[PDB]
């Protein structure tokens, strides 16, 4: 049942900008999310001090996907364990405790990819979190689908637009509510030529070219969040990427880099079936 939103697909209602995504299949400068627009959006929250750590996503009733640097990043002396965080699902407001709406979950175990490269370019920036107890879906809580080889093959194309969401910084103030931005996938060469960092096959970049007129990008706080696409084949939402890194936010000639989820699905499957 993944990828079908209770307040949209299940009711046959389209969100305000999904048409822009489907039409391309030939957070800075984003807008406020609609209620129930991204029911898989998860907020990583720190108990003490109480603060937003990162974004993340719900892929089942017991598993959450996020970027590994959200938990482990030696350069900033970051190395969180299970007891340090709470997972907040069903949220809209960044700061408010949405009583009767959001659900706060506890973590059982965290799993960081064994070959996560924090020393150089955040290669394989991915981590899975097992919740203590299953979350109950609602109109505001529902998992996103993970891509299969065919869906990845057909959708992950330069020019095709994806959607990024998060409560991160608006400029390189934090938003009141969840922000959303739709960005085009960029040609590998262009991604390569815009930075000095060595790009690997486990990443893809997205954003508009300086001449495209439109702009937008993820920023601090958006990390771990999902980059999703809606399949024009089965009308389900799939997570193709994880907000990973950038050099600044919304800088001309620069692009955001995302973890290529499909390229890492074998690790994901392995972990999930191995550890329940």
């Amino acid at each position: 049942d993944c990828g079908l939103r209770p307040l949209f697909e299940k009711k046959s209602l389209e969100d305000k900008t999904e048409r822009e995504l489907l039409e391309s299949y030939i957070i800075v400068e984003g807008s406020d999310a609609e209620i129930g627009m991204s029911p898989w959006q998860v907020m990583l929250f720190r108990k003490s001090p109480q603060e937003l750590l990162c974004g993340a996503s719900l892929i089942s009733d017991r598993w959450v996907l996020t970027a590994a640097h959200c938990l482990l990043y030696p350069p900033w002396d970051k190395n969180f364990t299970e007891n340090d965080l709470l997972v907040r699902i069903g949220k809209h407001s960044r700061t408010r405790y949405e009583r009767n709406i959001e659900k706060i979950s506890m973590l059982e175990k965290i799993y960081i990819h064994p070959r996560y490269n924090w020393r150089e370019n955040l290669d394989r920036d991915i981590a899975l979190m097992k919740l203590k107890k299953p979350v109950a879906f609602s109109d505001y809580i529902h998992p996103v689908c993970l891509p299969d080889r065919e869906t990845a093959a057909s959708l992950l194309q330069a020019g095709y637009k994806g959607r990024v969401t998060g409560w991160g910084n608006l400029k390189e103030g934090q938003p009141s509510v969840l922000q959303v931005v739709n960005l085009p996938i960029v040609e590998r060469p262009v991604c390569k030529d815009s930075t000095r960092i060595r790009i690997t096959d486990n990443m893809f970049c997205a954003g508009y070219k300086p001449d495209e007129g439109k702009r937008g990008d993820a920023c601090e706080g958006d990390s771990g969040g999902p980059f999703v696409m809606k399949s024009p084949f089965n009308n389900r939402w799939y997570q193709m990427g994880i907000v990973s890194w950038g050099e600044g936010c919304d800088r001309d000639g620069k692009y955001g880099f995302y973890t290529h989820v499909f390229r890492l699905k074998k690790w994901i499957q392995k972990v999930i079936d191995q550890f329940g």
């Binding site: 929250f45 108990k47 109480q50 603060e51 709470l86 405790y97 706060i104 506890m106």
Partner: peptide
């Protein structure tokens, strides 16, 4: 500026 969440989750 985060609102006080229930202590029942903090434990």
């Amino acid at each position: 500026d985060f609102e006080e969440i229930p202590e029942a989750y903090l434990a």
